[PDB]
Amino acid sequence: AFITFFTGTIAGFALAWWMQWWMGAVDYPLNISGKPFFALPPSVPIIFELTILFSALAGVATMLALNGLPRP
Amino acid sequence: RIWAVPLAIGVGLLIVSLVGWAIDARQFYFSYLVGWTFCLTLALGSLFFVMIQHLTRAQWVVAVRRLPEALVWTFPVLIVLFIPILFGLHDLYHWTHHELYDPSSPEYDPILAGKHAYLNVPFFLVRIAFYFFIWTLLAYKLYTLSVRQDVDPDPSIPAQQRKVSAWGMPLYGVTVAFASYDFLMSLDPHWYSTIFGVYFFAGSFFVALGFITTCYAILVRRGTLQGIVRAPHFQDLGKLMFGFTAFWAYIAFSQYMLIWYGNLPEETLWYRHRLEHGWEVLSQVLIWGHFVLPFLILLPWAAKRTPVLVGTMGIWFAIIHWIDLFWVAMPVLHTEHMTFHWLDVTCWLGLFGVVVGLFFYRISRHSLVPQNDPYLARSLAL
Amino acid sequence: MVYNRCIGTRYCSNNCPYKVRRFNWFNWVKTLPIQVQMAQNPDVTVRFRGVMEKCTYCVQRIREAQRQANIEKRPLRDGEVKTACQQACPAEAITFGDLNDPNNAVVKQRQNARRYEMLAALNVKPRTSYLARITNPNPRLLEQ
Amino acid sequence: YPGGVALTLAQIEAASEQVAQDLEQALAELEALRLLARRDETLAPYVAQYEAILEAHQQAVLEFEHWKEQVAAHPGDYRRANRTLGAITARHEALLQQYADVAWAVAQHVNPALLARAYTSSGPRFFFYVVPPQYARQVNEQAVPPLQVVRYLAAQ
Amino acid sequence: VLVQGGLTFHDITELVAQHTEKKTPKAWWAAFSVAFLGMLTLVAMLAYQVWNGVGVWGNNIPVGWGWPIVNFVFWVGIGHAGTLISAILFLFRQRWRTSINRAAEAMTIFAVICALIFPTFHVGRVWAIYWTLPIPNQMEMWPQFKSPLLWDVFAVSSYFIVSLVFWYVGLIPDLATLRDRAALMGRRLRAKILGFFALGWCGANRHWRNYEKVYMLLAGLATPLVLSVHSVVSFDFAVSIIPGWHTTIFPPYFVAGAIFSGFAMVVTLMVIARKAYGLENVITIDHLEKMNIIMLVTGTMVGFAYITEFFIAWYSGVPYEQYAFINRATGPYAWAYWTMMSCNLIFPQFFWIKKLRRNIPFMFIASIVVNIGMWFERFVITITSLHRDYLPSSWDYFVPTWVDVLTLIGSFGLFFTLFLLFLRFVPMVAIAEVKGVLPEADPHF
Numbered sequence A: 001a002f003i004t005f006f007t008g009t010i011a012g013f014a015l016a017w018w019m020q021w022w023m024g025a026v027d028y029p030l031n032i033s034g035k036p037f038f039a040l041p042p043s044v045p046i047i048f049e050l051t052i053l054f055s056a057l058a059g060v061a062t063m064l065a066l067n068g069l070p071r072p
Numbered sequence B: 001r002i003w004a005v006p007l008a009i010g011v012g013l014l015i016v017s018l019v020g021w022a023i024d025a026r027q028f029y030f031s032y033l034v035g036w037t038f039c040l041t042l043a044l045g046s047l048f049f050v051m052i053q054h055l056t057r058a059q060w061v062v063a064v065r066r067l068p069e070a071l072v073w074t075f076p077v078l079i080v081l082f083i084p085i086l087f088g089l090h091d092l093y094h095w096t097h098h099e100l101y102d103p104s105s106p107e108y109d110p111i112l113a114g115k116h117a118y119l120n121v122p123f124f125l126v127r128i129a130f131y132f133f134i135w136t137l138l139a140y141k142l143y144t145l146s147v148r149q150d151v152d153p154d155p156s157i158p159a160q161q162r163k164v165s166a167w168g169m170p171l172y173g174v175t176v177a178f179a180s181y182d183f184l185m186s187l188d189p190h191w192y193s194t195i196f197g198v199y200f201f202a203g204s205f206f207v208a209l210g211f212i213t214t215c216y217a218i219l220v221r222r223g224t225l226q227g228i229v230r231a232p233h234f235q236d237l238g239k240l241m242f243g244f245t246a247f248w249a250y251i252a253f254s255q256y257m258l259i260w261y262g263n264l265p266e267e268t269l270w271y272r273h274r275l276e277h278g279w280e281v282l283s284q285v286l287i288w289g290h291f292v293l294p295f296l297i298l299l300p301w302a303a304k305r306t307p308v309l310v311g312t313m314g315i316w317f318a319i320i321h322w323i324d325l326f327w328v329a330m331p332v333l334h335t336e337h338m339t340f341h342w343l344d345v346t347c348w349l350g351l352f353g354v355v356v357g358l359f360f361y362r363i364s365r366h367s368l369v370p371q372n373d374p375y376l377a378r379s380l381a382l
Numbered sequence C: 001m002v003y004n005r006c007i008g009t010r011y012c013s014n015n016c017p018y019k020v021r022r023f024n025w026f027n028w029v030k031t032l033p034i035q036v037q038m039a040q041n042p043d044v045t046v047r048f049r050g051v052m053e054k055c056t057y058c059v060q061r062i063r064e065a066q067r068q069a070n071i072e073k074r075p076l077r078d079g080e081v082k083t084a085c086q087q088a089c090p091a092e093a094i095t096f097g098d099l100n101d102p103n104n105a106v107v108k109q110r111q112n113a114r115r116y117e118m119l120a121a122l123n124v125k126p127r128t129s130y131l132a133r134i135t136n137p138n139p140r141l142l143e144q
Numbered sequence D: 001y002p003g004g005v006a007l008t009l010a011q012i013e014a015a016s017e018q019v020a021q022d023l024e025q026a027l028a029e030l031e032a033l034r035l036l037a038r039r040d041e042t043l044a045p046y047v048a049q050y051e052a053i054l055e056a057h058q059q060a061v062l063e064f065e066h067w068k069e070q071v072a073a074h075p076g077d078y079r080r081a082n083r084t085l086g087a088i089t090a091r092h093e094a095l096l097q098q099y100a101d102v103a104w105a106v107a108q109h110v111n112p113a114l115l116a117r118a119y120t121s122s123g124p125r126f127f128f129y130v131v132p133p134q135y136a137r138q139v140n141e142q143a144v145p146p147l148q149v150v151r152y153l154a155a156q
Numbered sequence E: 001v002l003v004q005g006g007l008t009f010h011d012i013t014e015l016v017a018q019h020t021e022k023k024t025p026k027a028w029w030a031a032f033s034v035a036f037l038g039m040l041t042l043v044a045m046l047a048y049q050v051w052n053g054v055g056v057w058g059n060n061i062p063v064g065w066g067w068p069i070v071n072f073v074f075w076v077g078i079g080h081a082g083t084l085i086s087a088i089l090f091l092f093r094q095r096w097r098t099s100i101n102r103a104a105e106a107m108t109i110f111a112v113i114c115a116l117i118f119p120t121f122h123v124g125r126v127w128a129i130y131w132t133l134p135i136p137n138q139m140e141m142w143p144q145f146k147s148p149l150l151w152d153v154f155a156v157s158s159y160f161i162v163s164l165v166f167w168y169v170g171l172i173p174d175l176a177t178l179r180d181r182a183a184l185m186g187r188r189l190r191a192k193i194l195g196f197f198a199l200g201w202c203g204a205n206r207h208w209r210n211y212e213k214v215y216m217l218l219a220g221l222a223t224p225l226v227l228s229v230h231s232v233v234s235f236d237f238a239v240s241i242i243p244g245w246h247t248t249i250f251p252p253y254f255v256a257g258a259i260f261s262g263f264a265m266v267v268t269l270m271v272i273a274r275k276a277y278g279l280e281n282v283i284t285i286d287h288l289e290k291m292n293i294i295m296l297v298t299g300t301m302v303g304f305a306y307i308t309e310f311f312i313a314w315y316s317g318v319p320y321e322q323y324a325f326i327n328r329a330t331g332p333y334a335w336a337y338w339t340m341m342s343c344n345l346i347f348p349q350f351f352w353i354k355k356l357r358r359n360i361p362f363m364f365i366a367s368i369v370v371n372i373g374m375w376f377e378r379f380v381i382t383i384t385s386l387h388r389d390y391l392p393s394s395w396d397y398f399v400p401t402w403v404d405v406l407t408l409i410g411s412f413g414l415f416f417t418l419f420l421l422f423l424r425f426v427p428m429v430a431i432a433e434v435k436g437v438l439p440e441a442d443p444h445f
């Protein structure tokens, strides 16, 4: 299920990176400090870190799915 | 022989690169720095590998222990290779010019009461010649020891190596910081950054993990061994190459997002390096080629531990430090014209051969794997 | 600044070299009586606890002017708008006329030699590029 | 978001052509101003006061291609045409307005009166009980020239 | 060997059961009194706050922050210790963490709770903080992702989660053990029905291998997050233009502060979790011995940065950054920095004497004092360069109010209050891996 961790990183990565190409420039932009509209660096600790959450939980949704652990 | 081919081809090439010190003069001194400090980072990185192997002691990666120790005694040879800097030292750091503090020049660069105590080129002599009394002393106190627990086994075998790690440990991390603050901080001294003492450190211990790793990966295939050092040894080296690629890119990016934000005068490292003059090319193709291709390719544990890949990575993982460090050392000259010269590379393949010349000649001088050692078969029978 | 959207984490202020992002610490206006309330002018956003605030160049009278120029096509004159720091300072120190309008007083007072740029060194590129003082001592004349 | 980007791409072209036709007019006036007020005024900052806009106006032409080509390259994002058009018309009407403010001073010295055909000249907001601005915008539009301001001074 | 205990695989279960078997402690009844009283003082002043306004804390405008966010960096820096000895010690696979691990993400997760309250509450407008989240809200508005105060939210709203989910997953064999005991020997027949957090556990091959690679995953996937959480909470400082902050070494530094803070509290918990309710056979004193190295690592890595700070003032500083650190030593806070740096440097360089000072009672009197400098470290670094920054006009001392201190105290209150609460319910020790790692679980017998 690292091959199932595939979809964890991509969607979260795409989520943040889509949470800014949709947000920082195209829909309600702002000249906050001349920041050039979702230039990579201040997006990295979200395009990195928010990926970790949505990619870890899928990493554990697998864990709760291998022979479906919730079978008390 | 195995020892003289990287040496004769590299010193054959280094003696050829005397042409640099003679012709296109100021170019070669600083292609020598990017090469010289790489050999130093190789010394610096793989030594810290030995240290951390002893502090939180690790009997699991010990077949890959004796060989770093060989790498260290380079740095005494790296002393006599400090010479080409010194003739060009008055031409490089821009504070050695001494026509600037309060002489008749139009410039009173604010260096008079601030820096002139820390930097005065006879002080620079001792600020590094002092380090030769430490980073070599580790060699003459560690390499003399760890080679010697084989033939003359001690009652207290490791705990003398620990003694180096008990008081010879912290001075290392200090002298690495001040070294970087003395060598590579100073090319564009209109810059003040506290992290960069670690970017040199981590960017060293980043690399040398790879060179130690690829050596076995080379010396496992058609080497003196082929199956002794098992696969899950390298499985840890991957876990290290990730855990220290993080400790690099965390640093190479904390140097970036922090300075990409504020836009201060200290930024002028990168108004000249990053964007302009054929180096936005460098940084992009660097970071795509320096963090993500390693962090992506090595990741899955179905070929992460294979020898020949991680050996193939040690090439892409250490040849790239040229591209990492050529983004620091040389650009203050070719700030006008990004035209990297042939002399930029002769010293890379030179010193990366010359260091390895000595590195095999010492492994020719004596053993390879410690003939007796604590927990050896515990790591071999693994 | 918008006195609505803020929340009061105050790190709006801590960045600025000039600690001018003041902050409505307590709710002074809620306890304001039934007398002074005549005085707060009926054109600007009085502010609630947990909110920053700053100069804004007296934006309020930019708006009623620029709006009055959006109704009817026009520019803004050299003196159609006067800020409070301008219109009150009897020494005609502050001028405020719009930059990129070369006939106005600001472009003459900015193009002057001493465009004193206070803590410019932080690469901040601000407006109100104001002027220094020129104290004028005396030739010797047995001064010292 | 009615029907995509390709609809607005006709009017954004219709703005850039107004700019291109004004390259002629502004640079034409820049000849005429050197001809009209040869020596009838200071003219040392005041002529360059008119040129300083001109390097910006021409600079925006190459941009207005780049602005526009970034739109016509991909017509699948409505939130760039309204903005590029709102930028052009502002970066256009500004430069029209900046030409005028430098050009009305020309009459202000040649004529002792900056003329009563200068601006809307309506008044403050409390002067709406007498004069709504509605009247004024039909004075300003139907009297004031955008860039027939100095050719008007050929009649003087 | 790395645990000293005459144990077998069974000997832990009877013992940790006796630590969760019956509900009649007395010292509990005192701790839940004084600690909850601490929590009562917290909310007694924290809703007194929001009905009234921020300025009852001692914050002037130049130093807008004061003790609350100082305590946020504290009560999150304190917490990284717990999650990283779960992650790091598996990455290096030192096979050593097992005696303490499961009690540590507790020591993280509750710290993160009493941490996260501060960003929700040192603001003045708490109710309007859901705007900070990226919900498609009632208008076309969304937050600003160039703001480390927002990174903090996602980080902590991920770090509360990942550390939890990595702790909850960490303690599955406990619930299996306790679900298994609740039927045959335990509190009630209806503790089994409470232990459905076992999630159909049987300890099988098919999913235990997966548990290992997941525990590997979260180790190599929460450490890259831990190095981003506290780094974010350092980025908020150093991203600024302030000279005492913009120095770029801070994110590694504050992380080392989180080490040198967090283990400086874990030892305070382990000492008192070793005297009365202790595990002599499982919490081997040799563990705390090899524990204080990674403290003493940051007992000097923290120290090297002070040199760099104190150095760059002499090397190539702005004429303000030159003054920024002369302030720290010489000025109002000479009581802090001279003693703080000395406190955080003397005691670690006075620590390694008698083979790391295995002696247990010195641990408590030192682990406090090591930590008190941390609350100063973040009261110094934040504030000592936040006044006296680029103007004399913005020169103002920071007088902390009597409500600043009851929130600090209350943070200890809710920490102990809720750390003790689940701790008495869950098992303390990571009993699953303890009997699986060092004892005769090895197939070589």
Ligand code: SF4
Binding pocket: C054, C055, C056, C057, C058, C059, C083, C084, C085, C086
């Ligand atoms: S008077 Fe000046 S300083 Fe005061 S708010 Fe208005 S514009 Fe700002």
Ligand code: F3S
Binding pocket: C005, C006, C007, C008, C009, C010, C011, C012, C013, C051, C052
């Ligand atoms: S940082 Fe921002 S959210 Fe408000 S309190 Fe300051 S303007």
